[PDB]
């Protein structure tokens, strides 16, 4: 099913950065 963006954000929040949905998948923003 389509990517949960809010779940991806919280999963990146563990490290201290936000999340991006990238095709059924999740990556984070180390800017």
Q: What is the 3-class SS of 5-31, one letter each residue? A: HHHHHHHHHCCCCCEEECCCCEEECCC
Residue 8 near residue 21, CB atoms below 8 Å = yes
Which residues lie across from 21 on neighbouring strands?
26
CA distance 18 to 6: 10
User: Token pair 């936000």 is at which residue?
Assistant: 18
Picking from 30, 19, 13, the residue whose alpha carbon sits closest to that of residue 5 is: 19
The experimental method behind these coordinates is NMR
Q: How many domains does the chain have?
A: 1
Buried b (16+ CB within 10 A) or exposed e, 3-12: eeeeebbeeb
What is the domain range of residue 14? 1-31
CA distance 23 to 15: 22
């Amino acid at each position: 099913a389509f990517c949960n963006l809010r779940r991806c954000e919280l999963s990146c929040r563990s490290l201290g950065l936000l999340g991006k949905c990238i095709g059924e998948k999740c990556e984070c923003v180390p800017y």
